[PDB]
């Protein structure tokens, strides 16, 4: 019943500001403190501070003084995290988390319910849609019980993109590889393995979406 939902991924230029929201429900919002946690890619969790949901008074880690501001809008059980004068080191995912209990102030409590996290990309690079390419086996490879297919999602910015197969009806034997940034452009691929007795007989398509550019491609994988 209790759940915290955060806003979507943000793309901001250095020097700009970003405001993240965290909507709570399922409990008395004003009874539990709300904490904020940062996590840069491949790095660990960093406590930023917490905000007293009853008084609105924030408490920041000395490492997050000045540029960060926690706020509230109790009316709609929402907590906000605003970051001013963004810099590349602010590029990371930010989580809001509820304190498991209450009653004390000087002490803290474990974080039981967490938002899904909001990824903030700090870059000057421009938004670019991806090109979606079908990856079908070579003509003269054949043979076998299984056949591996794929899709190449190239030249987009920023993250994320979603890639599914046959609208999600194909999930077994699927591998989606993390995007790699090269020259301000992202590239990612995904592979799917199905019975050679089913493809090319039965249709296999990868569904690709890039929210930032509103791109939606359903690329059918056809023999060569």
């Amino acid at each position: 019943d209790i759940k915290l939902v955060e806003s979507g991924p943000e793309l901001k230029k250095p020097g700009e500001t970003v405001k993240i929201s965290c909507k709570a429900s399922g409990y008395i919002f004003t009874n539990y403190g709300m904490n904020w946690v940062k996590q840069a890619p491949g790095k660990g969790l960093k406590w930023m501070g917490w905000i007293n949901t009853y008084t609105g008074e924030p408490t920041y880690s000395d490492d997050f003084k000045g540029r960060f501001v926690f706020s509230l809008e109790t009316s709609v059980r929402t907590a906000y995290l605003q970051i001013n004068n963004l810099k590349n080191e602010d590029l990371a995912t930010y989580f809001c988390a509820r304190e498991r209990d209450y009653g004390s102030r000087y002490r803290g409590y474990a974080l039981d319910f967490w938002g899904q996290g909001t990824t903030v990309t700090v870059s000057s690079a421009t938004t670019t849609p991806p090109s979606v390419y079908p990856l079908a086996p070579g003509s003269g490879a054949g043979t076998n019980s299984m056949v591996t297919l794929g899709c190449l999602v190239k030249g987009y910015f920023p993250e994320p993109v979603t890639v599914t197969w046959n609208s999600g009806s194909l999930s077994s034997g699927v591998h989606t590889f993390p995007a790699v940034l090269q020259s301000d452009l992202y590239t990612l691929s995904s592979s799917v393995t199905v019975p050679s007795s089913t493809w090319p007989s039965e249709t296999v398509t990868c569904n690709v979406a890039h929210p930032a550019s509103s791109t939606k491609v359903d690329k059918k994988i056809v023999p060569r």
């Binding site: 880690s61 002490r107 474990a110 974080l111 591998h175 989606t176």
Partner: protein, 214 residues
């Protein structure tokens, strides 16, 4: 401020095996500590709070202990999906700092990658570009090297590699390697080869095609 020193940085153990993660506080935190588990690209999950109390719904194979400055997280009889990152955190006085984290990998039998190569698509070539892709799927250990060869000569420039996280079901890893060239350079050569060197073989595990785009 009280800082948490977590050990070890990484662990690798087999299903059914046991492991212990340590976290020492720079000052007495009187049991105000919790342990979290975090899967790649997901919110951390609370495992234990108040040093040894199991969070609701968490398997009993996870247990916490300790007092003063010394705390431990013990995982009893590992399950395939216990891989991921684990963090401790204290909350005796702000700041409520987290430990550096411990990455846990499930150790399994070595497995050679299954290699698949893919010539550039017709729609990418019309755009003037040409990416040759190679999938190296379901292997263990994670360490692997891919070498690209154009007409027999290694090419190390314009290559982008990406590894997946550990598979929750079979505990293997997979990696994709993309070689990008202009359509012009792609079409002035014939054989394109992708060679993987992995602990599982003393010879390269190869896959190639010639520009009839076989």
């Amino acid at each position: 401020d009280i800082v948490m020193t977590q050990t070890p940085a990484s662990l690798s153990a087999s299903v059914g095996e046991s492991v212990t993660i340590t976290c020492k506080a720079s000052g007495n935190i009187h049991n105000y500590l919790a342990w979290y588990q975090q899967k790649g690209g997901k919110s951390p999950q609370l495992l234990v709070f108040n040093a040894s109390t199991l969070a609701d719904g968490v398997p009993s194979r996870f247990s916490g202990s300790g007092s003063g400055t010394q705390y431990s997280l013990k995982i009893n009889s590992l399950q395939p999906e216990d891989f991921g990152s684990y963090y401790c955190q204290h909350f005796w006085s702000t700041p409520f700092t987290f430990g550096t984290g411990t990455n846990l990998e499930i150790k399994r039998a070595d497995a050679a990658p299954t290699v698949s190569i893919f010539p550039p698509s017709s729609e990418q070539l019309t755009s003037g570009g040409a990416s040759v892709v190679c999938f190296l799927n379901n292997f263990y250990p994670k360490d692997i090297n891919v070498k690209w060869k154009i007409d027999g000569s290694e090419r190390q420039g314009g290559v982008l590699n990406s590894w997946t996280d550990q598979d929750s079901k079979d505990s293997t890893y997979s990696m994709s390697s993309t070689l990008t060239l202009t359509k012009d350079e792609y079409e002035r050569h014939n054989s394109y080869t992708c060679e993987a060197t992995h602990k599982t073989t003393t010879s390269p595990i190869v896959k190639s095609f010639n520009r009839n785009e076989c």
